[PDB]
Design a protein around this ligand. Structure first.
Ligand SMILES: Nc1ncnc2c1ncn2[C@@H]1O[C@H](CSCC[C@H](N)C(=O)O)[C@@H](O)[C@H]1O
Ligand SMILES: Nc1ncnc2c1ncn2[C@@H]1O[C@H](CSCC[C@H](N)C(=O)O)[C@@H](O)[C@H]1O
Lengths: 204, 204
């Protein structure tokens, strides 16, 4: 089995520090931060540029869940979020293709309501890696060593930033497994594209 | 270069036939057919099972446009629609990640408004194929010959159905190029996944 982790993911309930600037509307009734609707209220939010993008997770998970490697039951799928929650995604999850329906599902999960296909825990990325016994970890970043996707099969765990901008920071001294920074392309790609490339590298 | 075509795509303006059954509402203010919102009015629409799924085109294009093969300018991208409109998508199109924003853009294109990156013409699939000089054509379908993605490089043109249900049918006597039915997996996959696998097979 392989672990795929979308980490520091821009999928959060509205931060306490800006709750007073954001109200539910008919246009967007969800308690999930989305910079398409909430940009001005995020003005003074820490790391604002890498937060409030649930759509990245939506499209990435649509790719992952429908991949041949996932149909073969060879993936364990995790969303680690900016505020250290971990969602474990059952391989047979039928994720709504409608963005707002996706938000409705995720909102309930993040508020601690039981979902039999998506399990939520408070958990750091480093703690997740150790708990799943990750040993050979590939951290995906454009700044990494350029690797033909053919070699990705040598790793047990893949980490992709679930955010638009910046670089994934991890405390390697808190992680038991070995971490290698890997690039699969000379250009910055979107998280869903990287997830897709990894997934199809594993089948083909 | 390669041609990638999402064909008989479920992306259309609301058909005149069913406008008397559509009640306009402020939750969905677009003139694009979407079964999420129009399911009742579509009850006696011809081919309703393969229509009104613009989300399939959104996700597929998000994958195609960010693929390495597109960043390298080795793709010509076309959307052929259920009602025989053809959109030529400039490789540098910055497609909205927000679904409703996507629908706003597509609505104006389908209504004939000028967009320097997305060019619309009234055209059948067979005429498109001939006019771009498609030579070795792979029609993607789970009912075709099972093929390793490494062999896809031997084709210049790939056709994927931009719809949720049904099979792509083409008039052989109307196409100059050679058409072959190609399956890349023994299970039905979503259009976006097939698009992803093709693009990545061309890059790697
Ligand atoms: N060229 C590339 N090679 C490997 N991984 C990449 C990549 N481009 C983006 N990624 C992955 O996709 C995630 C989101 S893209 C986020 C910004 C990106 N780190 C940049 O500087 O451009 C990244 O965190 C990384 O995990
Ligand atoms: N296993 C597969 N191999 C190649 N192409 C596939 C495929 N599964 C789906 N596709 C493509 O994705 C499009 C939409 S999926 C539509 C229904 C699908 N043909 C089925 O019966 O299951 C199809 O028109 C086809 O072009």
């Amino acid at each position: 089995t392989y672990n795929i982790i979308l980490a520091k993911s821009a999928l959060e309930l509205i931060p306490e520090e800006i709750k007073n600037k954001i109200r539910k509307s008919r246009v967007y009734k969800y308690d999930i931060l989305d910079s398409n609707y909430h940009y001005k209220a995020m003005e003074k939010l820490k790391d604002k540029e890498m937060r409030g993008r649930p759509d990245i997770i939506h499209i990435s998970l649509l790719n992952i869940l429908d991949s041949p490697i996932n149909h073969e039951k060879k993936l364990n799928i995790y969303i680690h979020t900016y505020d250290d929650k971990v969602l474990k995604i059952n391989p047979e999850t039928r994720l709504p293709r409608n963005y707002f329906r996706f938000l409705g599902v995720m909102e309930k999960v993040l508020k601690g309501e039981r979902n039999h296909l998506i399990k939520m825990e408070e958990k750091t990325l480093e703690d997740l890696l150790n708990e799943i016994n990750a040993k050979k970890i590939a951290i995906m970043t454009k700044t990494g060593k350029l690797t033909h996707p053919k070699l990705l099969k040598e790793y047990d765990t893949f980490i992709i930033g679930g955010f638009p901008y910046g670089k994934l920071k991890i405390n390697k001294e808190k992680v038991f497994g070995d971490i290698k920074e890997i690039s699969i392309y000379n250009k910055g790609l979107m998280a869903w594209t990287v997830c897709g490339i990894i997934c199809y590298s594993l089948s083909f």
